[model samples]
Target: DDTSSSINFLTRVTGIGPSAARKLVDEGIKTLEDLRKNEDKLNHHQRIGLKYFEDFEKRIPREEMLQMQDIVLNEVKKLDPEYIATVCGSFRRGAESSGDMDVLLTHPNFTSESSKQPKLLHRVVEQLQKVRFITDTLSKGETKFMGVCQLPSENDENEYPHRRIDIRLIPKDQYYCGVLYFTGSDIFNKNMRAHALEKGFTINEYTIRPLGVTGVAGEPLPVDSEQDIFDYIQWRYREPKDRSEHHH
Candidate 1:
């Protein structure tokens, strides 16, 4: 188990592919301790991944997730009280434990397009980093920021560990669909998209649109709420909790 298990475990880290995993095992680096000693051999992403591998793998209980949620909400609200932020994915779906946390962020003034002025999302990320909440960034873009964050020292009741986090800046127009998409079970999303295609509509993380006879996509339909997307696609409304495919 140690040989194959070591290789499989390395593959779960962000930048380490099957080859890197195999190389690690081949080079007698079969544990996290070995990976740490050989940090120079790993790339930037892989290094951060290895640094927090165990922390990222630990399951965060709902109570801890709620505490993290509150910390994020308070910080974001300090910048823009009107900004909307919520923990999605397994956390939002009432999971007792989650592999990581997904946060969906939206602001009234931040539109989808690029602007000359600075953005609330970027500013918020900067602020969080300043406070040492975010340790490392895996990727950052206009629409999303992927990183690792730890519970503050004040809230570190048990030396709360680092957790993989996804912060998505969704456009207000696409909020509901974005919420539904991020709150998904992978299989549920696949089946939902398949159902949409069966009904001549294209469904995705951003928006849903009808397909014309020429196979061209039509304008995106306005989505006021989760129900609206289902109504447009003629599917019954499903509570977020009920959307769990629980494939595991």
Candidate 2:
């Protein structure tokens, strides 16, 4: 449910196009529920969508989500067996799928050992660069890296020459929270942050520790799965639909 085609429809009505619709979706306002209930700023498509109301829901399925995660994880594992990484952003938030995938990496020392990650950037770029289908590099930089790779398939005619990908390297301690923020539905990320802060915890890209004298910023909580993070925050796990409307 991370992506809403109604948003794609909004672009058509408003002349934003698919890419910009995705941007608008990223700014929040996902479902017809989100656009209609706003009570103000209802754009042309939203008004019509509400008037012609019908369910328009699609999901990227957990099975697919996990497969993408493994693809990303295996890619990183090839670089360094001990490298700490995960598909963060909307993906980590359990969105079944994401608008774009974000992978995070860090050295073991970033957590317990305090070791530095070396040559990681070059190594990853080299791997991505080798794939002929990854047509271009839209953007790149230190700490963050972006590129396009052809999802490379032989038989599929719908084969895209490239899909956008972005990766980041942060200190290990900040890993969990970053993953949540990046692999999230915009509305859900905001809601989760609000929940965390309200509950006397502070969260960021790396981890959500605890709020204390230093204020909810300490060692990373142990969270192997997204559910573990929820348990630590003491909130009931929400299904995707419920989270899409979390701000409500």
Q: Which candidate is the best by lDDT?
A: 1
Cα lDDT tens digits, model 2, 168-243, are 8766656655666666677787788789888877666567778887563777677655677788888887744465
- Give candidate 1 regions above 4 Å deviation: 1-6, 19-31, 113-118, 153-157, 246-248
Each model's total of backbone clashes: 0, 24
List per-prediction Cα lDDT, in the order shown: 0.83, 0.59
Question: lDDT of candidate 1?
Answer: 0.83
Error of 2 at 129 (Å): 1.5
What TM-score would every model get versus the actual structure? 0.84, 0.57
lDDT for each residue of candidate 1 in 1-248, tens digit (9 for 90 to 100): 67889888778887789988998898888877788899888887788987888788789999889888887888898878888887899887788988888998886666556352236678878888987878788777677888889887665365778989888888877888899898987888888888888899998989999999987889889987889999988987777787777532
Q: Using TM-score as the measure, which candidate wins?
A: 1
